């Protein structure tokens, strides 16, 4: 169950911080991934919300890019 | 009135003749603070046009995604470990502007449009920002 498509940081809005958290989770999973040690690590719900590109394949760089495209009106929605 | 902003953009000032192209380099003073991302749209006084937005944000050595149709650009400015970056003094944005050969003498502004978001971290928190300059003097008004 997704609460809001693109809302990787679970704050109830879709903005560029959602692309940031995805990139951070991928770049330093021990700090920022689903079981990370930082207080602002991505959450399980965030990984579901963030899987906007090729939904079903989980979180990759392309999910962050899709959020950027949406924010730029290059695509009309997420997913 | 707005308080002293956390981050200050400078669009520069320019002088051009009608018909010329102008490279507008936008720099940023974050007062030594790190920035995780930006998501912005630009604006320019008619009849000048922003023809293209560079896909490099040199201040962060990162690639920007663009959409000229909305004069938009965004990026994530993180190191290879995911940590937000402090910008250098290099341009954060470069805009390629055309001054049509029909443009009347005058001073024409370039700046942000209705959206300029400078993010601090990964949680939707944002710095306050402001922009200075962006005056393009065309001819001798
Ligand atoms: Ca969000
Ligand atoms: Ca995905
Ligand atoms: Ca100003």
XYZ file of C-alpha atoms and ligand atoms in Angstrom:
223
model
C 0.000 0.000 0.000
C 1.354 3.362 -1.198
C 0.358 6.500 0.723
C 1.500 9.003 -1.915
C 3.382 8.191 -5.155
C 6.876 9.744 -5.027
C 6.787 10.419 -1.285
C 9.987 8.549 -0.453
C 10.546 10.549 2.748
C 6.913 10.168 3.955
C 6.310 13.850 4.665
C 3.045 14.051 2.649
C 4.378 16.087 -0.238
C 6.355 15.178 -3.356
C 9.371 17.419 -3.843
C 13.061 17.242 -4.641
C 13.889 15.977 -1.110
C 12.250 12.727 -2.182
C 14.856 12.380 -4.934
C 17.564 13.177 -2.372
C 16.517 10.438 0.051
C 16.477 7.834 -2.723
C 19.993 8.872 -3.842
C 21.242 8.787 -0.262
C 19.804 5.328 0.357
C 21.565 4.044 -2.764
C 24.881 5.862 -2.094
C 25.231 4.858 1.583
C 22.783 2.063 2.476
C 24.304 1.509 5.959
C 23.509 5.116 6.844
C 20.452 5.979 4.801
C 18.899 2.696 3.599
C 15.819 0.885 4.980
C 17.795 -0.393 7.983
C 20.141 2.573 8.173
C 21.612 4.106 11.295
C 20.811 7.720 10.536
C 17.590 9.041 12.035
C 16.498 10.202 8.550
C 17.144 6.897 6.785
C 14.532 5.863 4.207
C 11.719 3.767 5.610
C 9.942 0.700 4.229
C 6.883 2.815 3.450
C 9.191 5.311 1.773
C 10.632 2.575 -0.470
C 7.108 1.584 -1.523
C 6.135 5.203 -2.209
C 9.349 5.901 -4.032
C 9.112 3.011 -6.510
C 7.629 5.221 -9.212
C 9.833 4.037 -12.107
C 9.200 0.465 -13.254
C 7.045 -0.078 -10.148
C 7.842 -3.574 -8.836
C 11.603 -3.389 -9.286
C 12.215 -1.463 -6.036
C 14.403 1.560 -5.591
C 16.964 2.493 -8.205
C 18.510 5.724 -9.538
C 15.723 5.894 -12.128
C 13.128 6.406 -9.365
C 14.891 9.644 -8.349
C 15.082 10.743 -11.989
C 11.369 10.082 -12.414
C 10.594 12.339 -9.440
C 12.764 15.044 -11.075
C 10.880 14.620 -14.366
C 7.534 14.935 -12.593
C 8.650 18.092 -10.769
C 9.722 19.582 -14.118
C 6.421 18.680 -15.825
C 8.298 16.417 -18.234
C 5.818 13.709 -17.191
C 2.268 14.291 -15.908
C 2.163 11.898 -13.012
C 3.694 9.357 -10.808
C 3.755 6.605 -11.070
C 9.660 42.773 3.827
C 11.671 39.538 4.209
C 14.368 38.667 6.733
C 18.020 38.310 5.748
C 17.870 35.140 3.563
C 19.831 31.987 4.326
C 21.077 31.787 0.736
C 21.641 34.529 -1.792
C 21.706 34.039 -5.558
C 23.379 36.596 -7.831
C 22.226 36.642 -11.476
C 24.882 39.214 -12.442
C 24.352 42.375 -14.437
C 24.893 42.682 -18.190
C 25.022 45.102 -21.066
C 24.024 44.045 -24.544
C 23.007 45.356 -27.930
C 19.761 44.278 -29.528
C 20.424 41.029 -31.472
C 23.116 39.718 -29.138
C 23.271 36.587 -27.039
C 23.956 36.919 -23.332
C 25.336 34.141 -21.089
C 23.790 34.658 -17.671
C 25.832 32.978 -14.919
C 24.024 32.689 -11.575
C 26.233 32.253 -8.512
C 25.187 31.475 -4.937
C 26.308 32.446 -1.437
C 25.122 29.826 1.025
C 27.175 31.372 3.868
C 29.185 28.129 4.148
C 26.041 25.981 4.508
C 25.524 22.717 2.608
C 22.642 22.275 0.180
C 21.157 18.898 -0.802
C 19.151 19.928 -3.856
C 17.498 22.750 -5.760
C 14.313 22.844 -7.788
C 13.646 26.119 -9.541
C 12.057 27.933 -12.445
C 13.413 31.041 -14.108
C 11.772 34.115 -15.624
C 12.799 36.910 -17.966
C 11.206 40.189 -19.143
C 9.750 40.120 -22.644
C 10.946 40.300 -25.368
C 14.156 38.623 -24.149
C 14.186 34.826 -24.147
C 15.934 32.152 -22.144
C 16.767 29.808 -25.043
C 18.538 27.105 -23.094
C 19.487 26.188 -19.521
C 22.860 24.474 -19.104
C 22.712 20.929 -17.678
C 25.821 21.558 -15.525
C 25.642 23.101 -12.045
C 29.309 23.898 -11.801
C 29.084 25.145 -8.193
C 28.155 21.604 -7.145
C 29.912 19.650 -9.978
C 26.560 17.986 -10.629
C 24.174 17.503 -13.479
C 20.880 19.335 -13.630
C 17.725 18.044 -15.240
C 15.958 20.716 -17.266
C 12.697 21.571 -18.928
C 12.895 24.653 -21.119
C 9.124 24.579 -21.633
C 8.663 25.710 -18.002
C 12.108 27.343 -17.654
C 12.796 24.727 -15.015
C 15.854 22.988 -13.594
C 16.590 20.717 -10.649
C 19.403 18.649 -9.204
C 20.620 16.721 -6.157
C 23.922 18.105 -4.894
C 25.372 15.233 -2.921
C 28.835 13.702 -2.684
C 29.436 10.083 -3.702
C 28.336 9.020 -0.198
C 25.059 10.993 -0.235
C 26.156 13.981 1.897
C 24.920 17.479 0.910
C 27.526 19.770 -0.621
C 28.711 23.294 0.078
C 28.708 25.134 -3.276
C 31.826 26.732 -4.690
C 31.943 30.247 -6.170
C 31.423 28.848 -9.675
C 28.032 29.333 -11.325
C 25.171 27.257 -9.863
C 23.183 27.880 -13.108
C 23.997 29.084 -16.603
C 21.220 30.492 -18.839
C 21.641 31.260 -22.536
C 19.606 34.369 -23.322
C 18.740 35.946 -26.665
C 18.092 39.686 -26.956
C 16.080 40.013 -30.159
C 17.353 42.465 -32.756
C 13.930 44.213 -32.377
C 14.371 44.884 -28.627
C 13.869 48.514 -27.501
C 16.534 50.228 -25.430
C 15.725 49.481 -21.804
C 16.694 47.515 -18.700
C 15.254 43.989 -18.666
C 15.234 41.619 -15.701
C 16.196 37.971 -15.449
C 15.637 35.986 -12.269
C 13.508 33.277 -10.768
C 9.852 32.699 -11.520
C 7.296 31.470 -9.007
C 9.337 28.551 -7.637
C 12.812 28.534 -6.162
C 13.444 25.782 -3.641
C 16.781 25.254 -1.939
C 16.710 22.085 0.174
C 18.838 21.405 3.281
C 18.583 17.702 3.765
C 16.292 14.789 2.845
C 13.136 15.669 4.799
C 11.585 18.551 2.859
C 13.297 21.247 4.973
C 14.324 24.304 2.919
C 16.532 27.356 3.334
C 15.122 30.825 2.795
C 16.537 32.359 -0.377
C 16.716 35.612 -2.273
C 18.114 36.752 -5.637
C 20.025 39.889 -6.560
C 20.949 41.703 -9.751
C 19.805 40.153 -13.060
C 19.654 43.502 -14.867
C 20.251 43.326 -18.650
C 20.763 46.816 -20.085
C 19.946 46.832 -23.787
C 21.300 49.803 -25.759
C 21.310 53.261 -24.111
C 17.921 53.870 -22.414
Ca 8.136 13.839 0.421
Ca 11.758 1.483 -9.293
Ca 16.094 40.856 -4.961
